[PDB]
Amino acid sequence: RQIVVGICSMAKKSKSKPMKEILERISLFKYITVVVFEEEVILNEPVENWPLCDCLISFHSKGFPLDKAVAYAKLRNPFVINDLNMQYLIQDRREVYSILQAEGILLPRYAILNRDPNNPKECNLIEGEDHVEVNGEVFQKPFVEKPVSAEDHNVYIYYPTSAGGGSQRLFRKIGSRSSVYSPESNVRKTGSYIYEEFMPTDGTDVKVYTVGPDYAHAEARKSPALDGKVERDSEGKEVRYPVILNAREKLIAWKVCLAFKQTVCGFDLLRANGQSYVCDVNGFSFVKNSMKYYDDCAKILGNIVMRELAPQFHIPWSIPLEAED
Ligand SMILES: O=P(O)(O)O[C@H]1[C@H](OP(=O)(O)O)[C@@H](OP(=O)(O)O)[C@H](OP(=O)(O)O)[C@@H](OP(=O)(O)O)[C@H]1OP(=O)(O)O
Ligand SMILES: Nc1ncnc2c1ncn2[C@@H]1O[C@H](COP(=O)(O)OP(=O)(O)NP(=O)(O)O)[C@@H](O)[C@H]1O
Ligand SMILES: [Mg+2]
Ligand SMILES: [Mg+2]
Numbered sequence: 001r002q003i004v005v006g007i008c009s010m011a012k013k014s015k016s017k018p019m020k021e022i023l024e025r026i027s028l029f030k031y032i033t034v035v036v037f038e039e040e041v042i043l044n045e046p047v048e049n050w051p052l053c054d055c056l057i058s059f060h061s062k063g064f065p066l067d068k069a070v071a072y073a074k075l076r077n078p079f080v081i082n083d084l085n086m087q088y089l090i091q092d093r094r095e096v097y098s099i100l101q102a103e104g105i106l107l108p109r110y111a112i113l114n115r116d117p118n119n120p121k122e123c124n125l126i127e128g129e130d131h132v133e134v135n136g137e138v139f140q141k142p143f144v145e146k147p148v149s150a151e152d153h154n155v156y157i158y159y160p161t162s163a164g165g166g167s168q169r170l171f172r173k174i175g176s177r178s179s180v181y182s183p184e185s186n187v188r189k190t191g192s193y194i195y196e197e198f199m200p201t202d203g204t205d206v207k208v209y210t211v212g213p214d215y216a217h218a219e220a221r222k223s224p225a226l227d228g229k230v231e232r233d234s235e236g237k238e239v240r241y242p243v244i245l246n247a248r249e250k251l252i253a254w255k256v257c258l259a260f261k262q263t264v265c266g267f268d269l270l271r272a273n274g275q276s277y278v279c280d281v282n283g284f285s286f287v288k289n290s291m292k293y294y295d296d297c298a299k300i301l302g303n304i305v306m307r308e309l310a311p312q313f314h315i316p317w318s319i320p321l322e323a324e325d
């Protein structure tokens with residue numbers, strides 16, 4: 001009798017190259033069998049018909065029925081790698097920043113503008129040419145405006161008059177671009193937003209990817225904040241720059257992983273003013289195009305499974321040593 005690790009996510013994720021790379025490696029564990037739940041089953045079958053597993057790796061993305069995943073876990077009580085209830089909170093940037101603050105994690109100064117869709121003018125916003133006031137809090141340009149929905153990637157940056165004004169509108173990458181300049185200088189007038197101070201960086205973002213609290217891979221990418229042209233190598237994959245996290249940042253990774261209860265967790269750092277600020281926590285995310293990450297991630301996940309479940313399966317297990325990479 002094998003320990004069964006169930007993978008429960010949308011097909012776009014379950015059949016992604018990084019997923020296939022990691023699952024083939026987890027399958028190399030002698031006592032582990034991987035079962036990938038079919039999307040048609042996830043969407044159309046009641047949770048009572050879903051396959052059994054002892055350990056569940058499951059995560060929300062666009063179109064995923066999180067309610068069903070939660071009901072399945074309640075029904076079968078598997079060992080859960082990425083907590084499902086926290087994935088509701090991960091979808092809401094206000095909840096994300098609230099958790100970060102509670103954990104003493106540095107983040108941009110921010111304020112929430114909650115807008116009544118039937119009374120859009122009644123909200124706590126005053127606008128000047130070079131600043132906004134949100135619930136009385138002043139944000140001088142440059143500042144950042146994010147939809148409260150973490151799944152809405154239409155994040156806008158507003159430039160000061162001294163820089164020519166206008167705004168940068170970011171979006172999910174469409175081919176060669178991830179943002180574009182707009183002459184519009186005034187903030188959006190419908191929707192709820194987080195406003196935050198613009199953190200000055202060297203023009204890159206640090207993307208961090210945890211596999212449990214003691215392993216995190218980091219890499220840097222050009223920020224879409226000022227120029228929206230995507231940098232590509234001769235093979236057409238986005239250019240990445242090497243990063244090694246300092247001691248403070250490794251602690252940040254440890255805190256984020258545990259606070260959100262997401263063993264596999266992507267989050268973003270802005271290296272600004274000699275500190276590192278978290279500006280986004282995405283939850284489940286694999287590194288792409290690193291063979292070493294595929295090896296390390298599968299080994300760690302397999303080891304977590306074996307550590308937790310070998311005793312009840314009466315399987316001998318000695319806990320091995322793992323890199324922090
Ligand atoms: O949220 P991120 O960690 O920054 O990674 C995203 C995410 O992929 P993952 O779910 O596998 O982490 C996107 O998926 P969604 O959030 O949109 O569901 C995907 O966007 P696609 O929908 O277009 O697949 C996008 O990849 P893309 O480069 O094609 O925009 C990719 O970011 P990266 O691959 O650049 O790291
Ligand atoms: N406060 C800030 N100061 C400076 N740059 C910022 C700030 N907030 C976000 N940015 C830039 O805007 C980009 C997108 O913001 P982010 O909060 O990551 O949006 P998202 O829509 O969640 N992106 P994704 O990583 O795909 O989930 C970041 O990667 C930074 O380059
Ligand atoms: Mg096996
Ligand atoms: Mg996601």
Ligand SMILES: [Mg+2]
Binds near residue numbers: 268279280
């Ligand atoms: Mg981000």
Ligand SMILES: [Mg+2]
Binds near residue numbers: 150280281282
């Ligand atoms: Mg995000």
